[PDB]
Ligand binder design. Structure first.
Ligand SMILES: C[C@H](CC[C@@H]1OC1(C)C)[C@H]1CC[C@H]2[C@@H]3CC=C4C[C@@H](O)CC[C@]4(C)[C@H]3CC[C@]12C
Lengths: 16, 240
């Protein structure tokens, strides 16, 4: 839900 | 009382992480459309200038919340919920901290400064611009330093009432350690002025109103031919 609706944002949180 | 060895270490932690994340995003004169100096290529470039710079800001913000003790322990869903609502508020916190009173200009980077009229030129509504500059002056009126800002931005990220939070009670628990740190810090900084801590929290009240105004700025933005690049559009645009 809140991860699919926010793909790019989700990506920033995982590049760490 | 005084700061606990722990808190002190935490406050140093935050102030340092806030410094490093900043270097890691703005130590490079961004690859963004240059500010012009009239026509529809500057009115559409200026706007690109801010929008493209804001992106970097989102990346810095995400990068710094990842460093705020406790943030990574929540679920990715809640990380998004929280981050998606504080970006505009955190931005205005930063915009404020970077405000110059004598020149009335907000300077993002070195050789990267903007006046109120730059914002107007950039495409933004007077409805939005005035409130942020008014907020910036209110902010300097409190004379906050680097520790207090770091702390206020942390406290901001952990707002339980933000839309769609799964574990509010949990988000709220995560906030308190920081509120305290600020409470105790301010007690040391101006013990003879107890109401200065509440004046601070009070700014959180205004950041919500600003967040609403900004939404009306987005709403009106997408009434023009001005569209937000993907990343921003995700966090701000109203889309299914
Ligand atoms: C509020 C304003 C407009 C947002 C609207 O949605 C639109 C249309 C982009 C945006 C435009 C560029 C941003 C700035 C760009 C870069 C930074 C650097 C960072 O250290 C701190 C943050 C700081 C100073 C941002 C504060 C917020 C600013 C002024």
């Amino acid at each position: 839900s809140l991860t699919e609706r926010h793909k790019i944002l989700h990506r920033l949180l995982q590049e760490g | 009382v005084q700061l606990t060895a722990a808190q002190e270490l935490m406050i140093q932690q935050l102030v340092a992480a806030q410094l490093q994340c900043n270097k890691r995003s703005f130590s490079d004169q961004p690859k963004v459309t240059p500010w012009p100096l009239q026509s529809r290529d500057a009115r559409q470039q200026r706007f690109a200038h801010f929008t493209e710079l804001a992106i970097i800001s989102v990346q810095e913000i995400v990068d710094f919340a990842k460093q705020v003790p406790g943030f990574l322990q929540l679920g990715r869903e809640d990380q998004i919920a929280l981050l998606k609502a504080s970006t505009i508020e955190i931005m205005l916190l930063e915009t404020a901290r970077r405000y110059n009173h004598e020149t009335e200009c907000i300077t993002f980077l070195k050789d990267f400064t903007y006046s109120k009229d730059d914002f107007h030129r950039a495409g933004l509504q007077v409805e939005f611009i005035n409130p942020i500059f008014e907020f910036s002056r209110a902010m300097r009126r409190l004379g906050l330093d680097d520790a207090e800002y770091a702390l206020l931005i942390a406290i901001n990220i952990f707002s339980a009432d933000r839309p769609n939070v799964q574990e509010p009670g949990r988000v709220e628990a995560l906030q308190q350690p920081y509120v305290e740190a600020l409470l105790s810090y301010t007690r040391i900084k101006r013990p003879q002025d107890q109401l200065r801590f509440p004046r601070m929290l009070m700014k959180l009240v205004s950041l919500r109103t600003l967040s609403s105004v900004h939404s009306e700025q987005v709403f009106a933005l997408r009434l023009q031919d001005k569209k937000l690049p993907p990343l921003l559009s995700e966090i701000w645009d109203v889309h299914e």
